[model samples]
Target: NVTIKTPDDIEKMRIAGRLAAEVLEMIGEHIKPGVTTEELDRICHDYIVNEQKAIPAPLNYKGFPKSICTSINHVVCHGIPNEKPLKEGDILNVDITVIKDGYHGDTSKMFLVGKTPEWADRLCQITQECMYKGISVVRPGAHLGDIGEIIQKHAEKNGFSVVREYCGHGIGKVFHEEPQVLHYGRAGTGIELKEGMIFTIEPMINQGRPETRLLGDGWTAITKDRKLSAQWEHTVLVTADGYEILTLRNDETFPRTS
Candidate 1:
């Protein structure tokens, strides 16, 4: 079931949300060729635990074994951080979630290791837009299916596909909750959006088919065709007027193609 946040819970979530955003900001600065993903993970772990005095939500969550997920190139999500150094022209997605004051904040962002290919850059930007397209319709009485439909339409229209295996979910005091948010579904169907509903709208778009395969490690998921994939995520709250982006990053600039 979707958990409704009280005023107090909302306030706590804001703190957690900002901290989670900061994790991205903290790590984004150091993303470049030659920096190992494991190094990026350590930076986030320290900032969340020592500086923010918060908990890194992904660490050991279901034995995830990482402070954050560092998915590179074809890895759709949950790519464990390791000593492998990132090289020029590589694209990466860093997923972060933080727990503070008993509440959770979840979000993710994509970064290009160095110079990026045209298709890779386009895919990343479109995936980010797909996230916003889904979020643009959040309001009382809206259907969850509306969010999914918009995302699906935008992705396919751009020559990309949405990953069906993983979808966003409700989040509050717990890491994952009910009211699973699909990225592709029939419009005007599924759960009705109401005030106080909080969830994530993370669309994972791929350059090839939407099919994916799980690595033997039991966590990392990669594109089945070995094609590049991208994703962007944010925690959203349904408000009396429209909606609030609980995990909006201060430094995010929505890029567009001319």
Candidate 2:
């Protein structure tokens, strides 16, 4: 069952959400070519622990070694940090999840390393749009399927495919909770959304087929076709009248109408 967050829980979540978004904002300047993902991980770790006085939820998360997730190019998600230096024209997704006052906040954004190809830029743009399309439908009385339907429609219409295996989930004090939020489903066919329900709306879109294959390391999930993939995420709260994006960054404007 999805938990309805209490007022105290919501207040704690807001703090966690802002901290998570701040990490993403601070890490943008370091995403240039030649920066290693391991270095990025270390920087974020220190900031979260020492600067923000929060916990990086991904660390030791089911044996995950890194504090943050750095997925590049064809990597869909869960790409562990390593020593590989980023190259020009590379695209990356940095996913951040932070815990503060016992509540969790999760969010991610795609970054372009230097000047990338137009196609890569388009894939990232469309993927973010898909996420926003999903969020635009969140409110009391909305269906989970409605979020998936809009995300899938926007992605497929632009020639991108939705990754089905990894869907968003209900979140709170626990890392993963109930109400798996699928990225593709029939509208009006799932659980009814209610006020105070907080969850993530992360959409993973692939430039090729949606199939994915796990790397031998057991964490990285890459596109089976080896084509580019992009993802964007935000923790959303179903409000009494509309919805609230808990993890929105300073650079983004919410209530996206497009």
Instruction: State in Å the error of residue 113, model 1.
Output: 1.1
1-258 per-residue lDDT for model 2 (tens digits): 999999988888888988999999999978899999999999999999999999999999999999999999999999999999999999999999999878999999999999999999999999988999899899888899999999999999999999999999999998799899999998997999999899999999999999999999899999999999999999988888878898888889755321
Model 2 stretches astray by more than 4 angstroms: 256-258
Please provide, for model 1 over 28-90, each residue's C-alpha lDDT reduced to its tens digit, 9 standing for 90 to 100: 889999999999999999999999999999998999998999999999999999999999999
Determine which window of 10 residues in candidate 1 has minimal summed lDDT.
249-258
Q: Each model's TM-score?
A: 0.97, 0.98
For all candidates, the clash counts are 0, 0
Which segments of model 1 are wrong by more than 4 Å? 253-258
